[PDB]
Design a protein around this nucleic acid. Structure first.
Ligand SMILES: [K+]
Ligand SMILES: [K+]
Ligand SMILES: [K+]
Ligand SMILES: [K+]
Ligand SMILES: [K+]
Ligand SMILES: [Mg+2]
Ligand SMILES: [Mg+2]
Ligand SMILES: [Mg+2]
Ligand SMILES: [Mg+2]
Ligand SMILES: [Mg+2]
Ligand SMILES: [Mg+2]
Ligand SMILES: [Mg+2]
Ligand SMILES: [Mg+2]
Ligand SMILES: [Mg+2]
Ligand SMILES: [Mg+2]
Ligand SMILES: [Mg+2]
Ligand SMILES: [Mg+2]
Ligand SMILES: [Mg+2]
Ligand SMILES: [Mg+2]
Ligand SMILES: [Mg+2]
Ligand SMILES: [Mg+2]
Ligand SMILES: [Mg+2]
Ligand SMILES: [Mg+2]
Ligand SMILES: [Mg+2]
Ligand SMILES: [Mg+2]
Ligand SMILES: [Mg+2]
Ligand SMILES: [Mg+2]
Ligand SMILES: [Mg+2]
Ligand SMILES: [Mg+2]
Ligand SMILES: [Mg+2]
Ligand SMILES: [Mg+2]
Ligand SMILES: [Mg+2]
Ligand SMILES: [Mg+2]
Ligand SMILES: [Mg+2]
Ligand SMILES: [Mg+2]
Ligand SMILES: [Mg+2]
Ligand SMILES: [Mg+2]
Ligand SMILES: [Mg+2]
Ligand SMILES: [Mg+2]
Ligand SMILES: [Mg+2]
Ligand SMILES: [Mg+2]
Ligand SMILES: [Mg+2]
Ligand SMILES: [Mg+2]
Ligand SMILES: [Mg+2]
Ligand SMILES: [Mg+2]
Ligand SMILES: [Mg+2]
Ligand SMILES: [Mg+2]
Ligand SMILES: [Mg+2]
Ligand SMILES: [Mg+2]
Ligand SMILES: [Mg+2]
Ligand SMILES: [Mg+2]
Ligand SMILES: [Mg+2]
Ligand SMILES: [Mg+2]
Ligand SMILES: [Mg+2]
Ligand SMILES: [Mg+2]
Ligand SMILES: [Mg+2]
Ligand SMILES: [Mg+2]
Ligand SMILES: [Mg+2]
Ligand SMILES: [Mg+2]
Ligand SMILES: [Mg+2]
Ligand SMILES: [Mg+2]
Ligand SMILES: [Mg+2]
Ligand SMILES: [Mg+2]
Ligand SMILES: [Mg+2]
Ligand SMILES: [Mg+2]
Ligand SMILES: [Mg+2]
Ligand SMILES: [Mg+2]
Ligand SMILES: [Mg+2]
Ligand SMILES: [Mg+2]
Ligand SMILES: [Mg+2]
Ligand SMILES: [Mg+2]
Lengths: 283, 76, 95, 46
RNA sequence: AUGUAUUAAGGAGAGUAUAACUUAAUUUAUGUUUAUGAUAGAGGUUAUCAACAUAUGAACUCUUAGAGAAAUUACUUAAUAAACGAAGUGAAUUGAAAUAUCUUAUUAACUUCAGGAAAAGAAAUCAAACGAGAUUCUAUGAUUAGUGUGAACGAAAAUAGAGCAGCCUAUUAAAAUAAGUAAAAUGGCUUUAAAGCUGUUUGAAUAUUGUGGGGAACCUUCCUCAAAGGCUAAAUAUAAUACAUGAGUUACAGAGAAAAGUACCGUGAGGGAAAGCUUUGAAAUAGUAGUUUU
RNA sequence: UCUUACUAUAGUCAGGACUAUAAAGGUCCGAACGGGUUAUCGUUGCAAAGAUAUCCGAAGAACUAUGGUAAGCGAGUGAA
RNA sequence: GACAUGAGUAACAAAAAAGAGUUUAAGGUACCUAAAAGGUAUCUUAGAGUCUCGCCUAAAGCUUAUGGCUACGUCAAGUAACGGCCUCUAAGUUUAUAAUCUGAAGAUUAUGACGAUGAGAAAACUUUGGUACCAACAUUUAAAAGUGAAAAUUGUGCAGGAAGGAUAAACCGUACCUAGAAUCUGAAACAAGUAAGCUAGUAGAGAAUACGAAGGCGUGAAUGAGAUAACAAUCAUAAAGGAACUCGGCAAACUAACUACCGUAACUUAGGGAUAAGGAGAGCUCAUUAGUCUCGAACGAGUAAAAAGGAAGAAGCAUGGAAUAUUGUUGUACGACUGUUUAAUUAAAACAAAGCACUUUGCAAAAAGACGAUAAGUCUAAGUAUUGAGUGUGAUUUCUGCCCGAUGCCGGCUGGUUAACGAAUUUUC
RNA sequence: CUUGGCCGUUAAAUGCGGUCUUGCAUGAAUGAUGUAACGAUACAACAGCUGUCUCUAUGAUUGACUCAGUGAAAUUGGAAUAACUGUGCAGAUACAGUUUACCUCUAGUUAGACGAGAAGACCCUAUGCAGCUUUACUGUUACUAAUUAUUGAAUACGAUU
């Protein structure tokens, strides 16, 4: 469906600029991507498409049982003709009767955990790479959806079942996100095996100013270039910072490690918080 | 439809308004109809055309004299 | 932008969808194709009788001087429903 | 100095911006009409 | 300008006998008095040569069904401005010779709701040892008591006048006499510290056989009234109309408007003229004439 | 209805040249168009921002048209 | 308010331009004539036209818009040879409905309604998603050829390119003006400004440059006729010299365009520099002709065919003949670059910019940031750490050192301090 | 300080370029430094070219001038409105003295009328303003912290002692 209106220019329902440096880009359409993947059965990949709304690539899959077509985030290496399947609604009877038992983590992971398959995080073994990690049991994928991103399964709340078979006891699983944060994720959370496509996205270069304008990005004016009435950094004869600690146009510290997360909003899913670089030079 | 010129309510005084428009209709007849020709100025005496022509001339001169004055001029 | 703009807008002054009728009356309905279907139940006809042999004219000779009607002792002289009914029984009782 | 701001002006914008309906259908427009009506204006809009 | 009386929704567009007003744009009738009125003819367009009173036909479009670029569309026996009122919200200029408290100011303004008025109202009121007896408007009390560092702000009792009306069985249809109320702490408003209003947290009693509120910190006695339920005209405010009065105006006055919110200016909100008559003809100014000088 | 930005719907850019392309370039010369470098004139001007020459961009971060949105306690828009 | 002065002065100069005849109406004079009338001539006012000359010309022309203080006899079922109204929707709007939020006003989400600058059957008679789509660019296609559109076909590049509905003739518009000659905006009869189509021909690559067929114009006396001083403006030419001028080569001049021509340095991010520099050629006549075309009958002839062509020739001071395209080179600073800015005194070294770096954002109901008398909520975003926001620097080569004391920020004790609260206390009447 | 020293460029160098530096008061993303390419940026030099100049002259059109027609404006206390020296609210057409000049216009010109216009420009004053800044004074918020209330229970540990 088309992406049009004053929202493309950074305006909200009042008509005022709420997101700066937006507008004038190329005419786009939004692609309806399926981040839930509830329908079971095999799905045949028809092609990998470019999507201007996201950095990663999308795959047009077709349901062999129904014929309905859908869009999903393509994995690194996924090409046309491949067959993906979602085991979120449950395991198929063909996989259950064969193994006989209700669940066999051994052969299960060897028959379902393939690139582009959507499985509950509980069913994915430790150390596996995933790129559509969900948070809630019945929620969509929210983490590591961007290009070249992937999460790692660190641990699972489980115990052994008298024959070296691990069985889930708790309600959550631990995953390492792209930012390096090891947090807690539901047991029935969404997860797609593989890595998000377009791994070389962050190596591109636009080359000229006009290319950034085509992508709906408008010029960014520095605070030093403004007047005292317009910015805390404005004013001064010549180039002058004014002995003013870096801040946003509204007083928010722009450097030094000031966290903008609300203090009352404590994250109860975090096991190991992110590592703060603390302003040190990485290279 | 024939529109009428915008005018002031009292000619040279009052608010500006516009009279109602005039509507003319031309019907295509099944049988032709021809109008008589207007009488000649010599035969219009039943209407007192002689007196009417003198009065008309005087009115034309009066509007012409006013036009010369409206141009900011006078007759030498 | 001066005195003329302050006059009332008319259809002969502008284009681009400014339609304003002249109270002629709706004689039908519009279609989705841009045409008009006339509804002859809305079309009006003029009932003119036959004037052959009619001796009345819009003028009366000035030898007959004008005279108004008299209704002594009757406030609602010409609008009296009783006089209309009483005059009906004597003249026409059937209908 | 003054500028020719009425160059290329259209009468469809005059009716939309200053027309009668633009005022009877709004809260602030009703005040305008009632103010001009109290003063005795003949031209209440446009 | 004031006063008196009456009244209680206002405008526009276009058209038309250019005193006559709505496509019927000069409708049709009744009664009385008619020169001792009222305050023995001529005359239907060469008209309305009759005033008063009572009736009566007609009375378009928009504001004002819906929609829309008001006076259009499309339908149909579709229809209510301002000012004044009450509550809510609530400045700044200014003064203090600066300036914060204060003052300006329970002001202007805005919003909501309501009627011809609205609001208020028949004491949980004031007084002081005697007594008054609802509300509203005006004056005095009063540049007072009092408050405030100051600048300034500022009552009540009582008195006089305008009006006067008491009730619950309210002359329109309501109470089984009022509990999260009175009151307290705290944060504010008001304010003299009382009383009154109020967010938060708490929280009474049962009648002069002295129960409850008030009497300006507060306690006590006494006096006084009886909250947590209600009704009520008049005097008051505003607008329109008419009339009365004038050491009020008489045309650069009066009003903004003697044809006006028109013309004209402005995108718009908005701003906003000039202009009387048949009388009189000052000064300045211009061209000449007479006398005189150059 | 000016103007700044954004938004929707549309329109315009002679001809030639180079470049890997028939078409892939904020490429080149240069009209329309859009700018306003320099000089003179004008300064009760033709003009409360004009004239002449000269100069710059001219397939782009381009130009243009009809509508729409955002402005006045807090500041709308701003390649500032 | 009236009336003076400057002053009967300035101005009536877009470097298009006028000259001589003719004629209509009304009126004013003189004469003829005194019976008025009429005639002849002339002047004033308001017009018309002929011959000549010039100007504009991808306009100052024609047809139409926006618009209109110009004027009202402007005539349509539809197509050819037409728009509106009407149907459908975009951006948005909404004193409509419901729910929700909210000191009142109001705001939000959904739905509905409204809303073109878009889409709407047929007619010289008519009533699924590349099996795709109709953004840009390129290509191909109504078969005699060429050219310009329409629509379609195919393809290319990344910046990845609407919505919705469908599929016997009412009402409204129709006149004139389009800005160099009487009408739009600029206070106005203003040397400015404004949308679309057409816009002869010659000549060219061309909408460049020059001429200009038609048309219009050479302003409403808002002017006309003379004269041709100083001086001003706008131009033209110039002996010898050639920047001696001047703050400064300001201004002016030189140069210039074209060719499938020759040749072209340092340096370089290997692309450039470069159209470097510097040279050659050009018009007219003509020998000559492989094919094409034409005529005659393989062959012959022919440029009253397009082209090719040479060390050919003629004339002149001169053949890029007139007009059109405004120098070359060198060393630095600043900024990489194309761009943007004080509308109307500063266009730049300032702003932006690709790139680079730092901080922040885990999205479990609110990601952060921004907005919200203040919320619901909106943008962010139908995005997810290679995302978004903020801050500084400003391509690339070579590099980015020392100091965490001060300030800011972040983290951290079973710590100190610690308002409210509160164990323990105390007082007036 | 200062036209710093030296070299090149000029007949002549406070310029420009190169170079050395003890740099009042360079400096590393308020980035340091060097090239290619780009520039209506700023500076300097060479060649060519020229009325820029030596040093102007002639020519053309439009104005300027005259006749006819139409017909403004800023300005103006009133004017019979000379020169010099002196005087004087301190720079005289107007006062003192002396001198000079028949009356009146036209075209040129701008020395003066402290010429006109703009409270234009500067400085100062006001217990006059506006915007901006901050470790000015006094305040409001974003935000942070504790807690009554909405709001009821269990267990353990630690610290007070
Ligand atoms: K008390
Ligand atoms: K509200
Ligand atoms: K340090
Ligand atoms: K520190
Ligand atoms: K430290
Ligand atoms: Mg940004
Ligand atoms: Mg950036
Ligand atoms: Mg920037
Ligand atoms: Mg600045
Ligand atoms: Mg600041
Ligand atoms: Mg500095
Ligand atoms: Mg018209
Ligand atoms: Mg029009
Ligand atoms: Mg329409
Ligand atoms: Mg302005
Ligand atoms: Mg416009
Ligand atoms: Mg309505
Ligand atoms: Mg209606
Ligand atoms: Mg004081
Ligand atoms: Mg006192
Ligand atoms: Mg009681
Ligand atoms: Mg209380
Ligand atoms: Mg109290
Ligand atoms: Mg009490
Ligand atoms: Mg007491
Ligand atoms: Mg009671
Ligand atoms: Mg008056
Ligand atoms: Mg008088
Ligand atoms: Mg007088
Ligand atoms: Mg006199
Ligand atoms: Mg606009
Ligand atoms: Mg280019
Ligand atoms: Mg001059
Ligand atoms: Mg260039
Ligand atoms: Mg160019
Ligand atoms: Mg003179
Ligand atoms: Mg003169
Ligand atoms: Mg002259
Ligand atoms: Mg004659
Ligand atoms: Mg039609
Ligand atoms: Mg609709
Ligand atoms: Mg349209
Ligand atoms: Mg023109
Ligand atoms: Mg004009
Ligand atoms: Mg003009
Ligand atoms: Mg041309
Ligand atoms: Mg013309
Ligand atoms: Mg002429
Ligand atoms: Mg010479
Ligand atoms: Mg020579
Ligand atoms: Mg020199
Ligand atoms: Mg010299
Ligand atoms: Mg030059
Ligand atoms: Mg030879
Ligand atoms: Mg020779
Ligand atoms: Mg630059
Ligand atoms: Mg540039
Ligand atoms: Mg400027
Ligand atoms: Mg500009
Ligand atoms: Mg400039
Ligand atoms: Mg860099
Ligand atoms: Mg958020
Ligand atoms: Mg910078
Ligand atoms: Mg830099
Ligand atoms: Mg306490
Ligand atoms: Mg630094
Ligand atoms: Mg003259
Ligand atoms: Mg002297
Ligand atoms: Mg004297
Ligand atoms: Mg002088
Ligand atoms: Mg002079």
């Amino acid at each position: 469906f088309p992406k049009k209106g004053q929202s493309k220019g950074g305006r909200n329902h009042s008509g005022r600029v709420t997101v700066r440096h937006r507008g004038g880009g190329h005419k786009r359409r939004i692609r309806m991507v399926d981040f839930e993947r509830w329908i079971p059965g095999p799905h045949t990949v028809l092609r990998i498409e470019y999507d201007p709304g996201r950095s990663a690539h999308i795959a047009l899959v077709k349901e062999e049982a129904t014929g309905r077509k859908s869009y999903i985030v393509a994995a690194d290496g996924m090409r046309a003709g491949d067959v993906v399947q979602s085991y979120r609604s449950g395991l198929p009877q063909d996989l259950l009767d064969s193994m006989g038992g209700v669940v066999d983590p051994g052969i299960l992971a060897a028959r379902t955990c393939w690139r582009g398959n959507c499985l509950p995080v509980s069913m994915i073994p430790v150390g596996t790479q995933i790129y559509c990690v969900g948070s809630r049991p019945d929620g969509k994928a929210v983490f590591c959806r961007s290009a070249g991103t992937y999460a790692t399964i660190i641990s699972k709340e489980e115990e052994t079942r008298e024959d070296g078979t691990k069985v889930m006891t708790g309600k959550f699983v631990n995953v390492r996100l792209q930012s390096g944060e090891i947090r807690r994720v539901s047991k029935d959370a969404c997860a797609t095996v593989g890595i998000a496509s377009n791994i070389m996205h962050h190596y591109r270069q636009l080359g000229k100013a006009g290319r950034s304008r085509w992508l709906n990005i408008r010029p960014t004016v520095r605070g030093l270039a403004m007047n005292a009435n317009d910015h805390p950094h404005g004013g001064g004869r010549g180039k002058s910072k004014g002995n003013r600690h870096p801040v946003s146009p509204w007083g928010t510290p722009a450097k030094g490690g000031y966290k903008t997360r609300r203090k009352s909003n404590v994250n109860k899913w975090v096991v190991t918080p992110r590592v703060r670089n603390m302003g040190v030079r990485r290279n | 439809v024939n529109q009428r010129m915008h005018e002031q309510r009292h000619g040279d005084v009052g608010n500006w308004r516009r009279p109602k428009s005039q509507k003319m209709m031309i019907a295509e007849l099944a049988k032709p109809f021809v109008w008589p020709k207007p009488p000649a100025e010599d035969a219009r005496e039943a209407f007192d055309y002689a007196m009417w022509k003198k009065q008309k001339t005087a009115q034309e001169q009066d509007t012409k004299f006013q036009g010369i004055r409206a141009q900011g001029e006078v007759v030498p | 932008g001066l005195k003329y703009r302050k006059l009332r807008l008319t259809t002969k002054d502008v284009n681009k969808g400014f339609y304003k009728g002249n109270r002629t009356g709706s004689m039908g309905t519009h279609t989705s194709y841009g045409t008009y279907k006339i509804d002859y139940t809305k079309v009006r006809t003029y009932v003119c009788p036959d004037l052959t042999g009619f001796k009345l004219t819009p003028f009366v000779s000035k030898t007959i001087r004008p005279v108004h009607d008299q209704f002594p002792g009757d406030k609602l002289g010409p609008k009296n429903p009783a006089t209309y009914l009483a005059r009906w029984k004597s003249e026409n009782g059937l209908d | 100095g003054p500028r020719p701001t009425m160059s290329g002006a259209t009468r469809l914008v005059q009716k939309r911006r200053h027309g009668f309906l633009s005022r009877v259908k709004t809260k602030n427009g009703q005040k305008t009409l009632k103010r001009r009506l109290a003063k005795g204006r003949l031209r209440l809009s446009a």
